[PDB]
Amino acid sequence: GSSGSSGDRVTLEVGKVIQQGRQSKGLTQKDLATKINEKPQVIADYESGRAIPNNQVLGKIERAIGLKLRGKDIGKPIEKGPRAKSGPSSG
C-alpha cells in the first residue's frame, strides 16, 4: 500500500509521539499499522494530525510504542519505559 507525501506541515503531538516512539524502536509506519491491525494509510495521516484520532486506536498505538497518546502527559511511558522530553504546541 503506497504512502508518503511529507513536505513541511504541522504534526499534532499525537503525530509527533507516534513518530518519536516509532523511531525510538526503529518501527516503520507499516510496522506500526501491523502492530495495531490498521492501514499504514491512517498512520501516515495520524502523523500530520489528519486522520480522526479515536481512543480505541490511540489505545492500540500506546501498546505499539510503550508511551501515552493522550493528556499533556503524552510521551510518558505506560507502566515502565524510558524517559522522553516534552514541549509546547500552538494552534
Q: Which three cell numbers stand for residue 4?
A: 508518503
Other beta carbons within 10 Å of 74: 21
Half-sphere exposure of 52 (CA within 13 A, CB side): 2
The secondary structure of 13-59 as a DSSP string is: HHHHHHHHHHHTTT--HHHHHHHTTS-HHHHHHHHHT-S---HHHHH
Q: Which three cell numbers stand for residue 31?
A: 510496522
Residue listed under C-alpha cell 500530520: 48
Whether 87 and 11 have beta carbons less than 8 Å apart is answered as no
Domain segments of the chain as ranges: 1-91
> Solved how?
NMR
Which residues on neighbouring strands pair with residue 77, listed in sequence order?
A: 67
Among the listed residues 33, 37, 34, the one whose alpha carbon sits nearest the alpha carbon of residue 45: 33
C-alpha 58/C-alpha 5 separation (Å) is 22
C-alpha 50/C-alpha 80 separation (Å) is 30
Superfamily grouping for domain 1-91: lambda repressor-like DNA-binding domains (1.10.260.40)
Burial level of 41, CB count in 10 A (0-12/13-18/19+)? middle
